[PDB]
Design a protein around this ligand. Structure first.
Ligand SMILES: *[C@@](O)(CO)[C@H](C[C@@H]1CCNC1=O)NC(=O)[C@H](CC(C)C)NC(=O)c1cc2c(OC)cccc2[nH]1
Length: 300
């Protein structure tokens, strides 16, 4: 038993991380095949002020890139923007390149961050994408270009590359196509996140996790229909439930219908009144149904 926010193991990704520096800027890149992908602001003269990315590319010089992995130095032979990333063709193929694909995550989906510090993998942790496209992580100077990934059916997907932190502390990055999640600009900007909408699917999963753990104080003699819940969600900054297929196994194994837990959400969102659930003091939307099934029952 127990519920922990976890990451899938990082070994397959670690050999792909390099240090990328240009001028006084230092961050991380992803070395796969004979390409290094990194945030394009590494070439900007002054990242503390609004950047004209046209001007920074016009004045770039390929020789000024410093790219390294331990005692391997990589020379850049071509540089392009691909969205908000640089794609740098280098003079050596990474012999440890794993088989991989690219995909974009969606709001409510979980993935893993390999947090990298000026080219050195430092830590690994799980995240969940918020409705506005942000994540809540722990990123500091030197961590841009840290990589998000997910393993799904024996396939490694690269899904995220880190760029910035909003004034409210939320973390912003791009897919590996260089499309910023949420559409935020790669600028030092007071751009606003927008209103956060909780993932109902994930809150339901969290309550199922508490039931699996043997905690059931919060369940009442009541149950809310799906249309009723969805009408409430729309006015209370929760997502509408579009399918209950993700909960069939959880309902079957716990004996509790999704509608019982929908009633719990509406009631608990008013406050836990000093109680906790899985030691939390408020509802948590960080765990997907898949995450809960996998770590609590060991299947899928
Ligand atoms: C990368 O390491 C840079 O290479 C860095 C990561 C952030 C540092 C603190 N937490 C992080 O996630 N990214 C930045 O420093 C970016 C660089 C931009 C995109 C060119 N800037 C910010 O994240 C940033 C600047 C400002 C700001 O200014 C003015 C005002 C409000 C928020 C804000 N975020």
């Amino acid at each position: 038993s127990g519920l922990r926010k976890m990451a899938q193991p990082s070994g397959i990704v670690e050999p792909c991380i390099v240090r990328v520096a240009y001028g006084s800027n230092v961050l991380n890149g992803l070395w796969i095949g004979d390409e290094v992908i990194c945030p394009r602001h590494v070439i900007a003269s002054d990242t503390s002020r609004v950047i004209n990315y046209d001007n920074e590319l016009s004045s770039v010089r390929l020789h000024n890139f410093s790219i390294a992995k331990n005692n391997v130095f990589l020379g850049v032979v071509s540089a392009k923007y691909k969205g908000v990333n640089l794609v740098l063709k280098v003079n050596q193929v990474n012999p440890n390149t794993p088989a991989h694909k690219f995909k974009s995550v969606k709001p409510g989906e979980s993935f893993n961050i390999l947090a990298c510090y000026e080219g050195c993998p430092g830590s690994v942790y799980g995240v969940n994408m918020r409705s506005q496209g942000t994540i809540k992580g722990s990123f500091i100077a030197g961590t841009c270009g840290s990589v998000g990934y997910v393993l799904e059916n024996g396939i490694l997907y690269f899904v995220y590359m880190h760029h910035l932190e909003l004034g409210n502390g939320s973390h912003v990055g791009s897919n590996l196509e260089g499309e910023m999640y949420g559409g935020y600009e790669d600028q030092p900007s007071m751009q606003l996140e927008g209103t956060n909408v909780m993932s109902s699917d994930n809150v339901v999963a969290f309550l199922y996790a508490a039931l699996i753990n043997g905690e059931r104080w919060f369940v009442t003699n009541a149950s809310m229909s799906l249309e009723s819940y969805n009408a409430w969600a729309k006015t209370n900054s929760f997502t509408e439930i579009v399918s209950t297929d993700a909960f069939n196994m959880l309902a079957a194994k716990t004996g509790y219908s999704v509608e019982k837990l929908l009633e719990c959400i509406v009631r608990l969102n008013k406050g836990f009144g000093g109680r906790t659930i899985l030691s939390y003091g408020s509802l948590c939307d960080e765990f997907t149904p898949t995450e809960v099934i996998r770590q609590m029952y060991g299947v899928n």
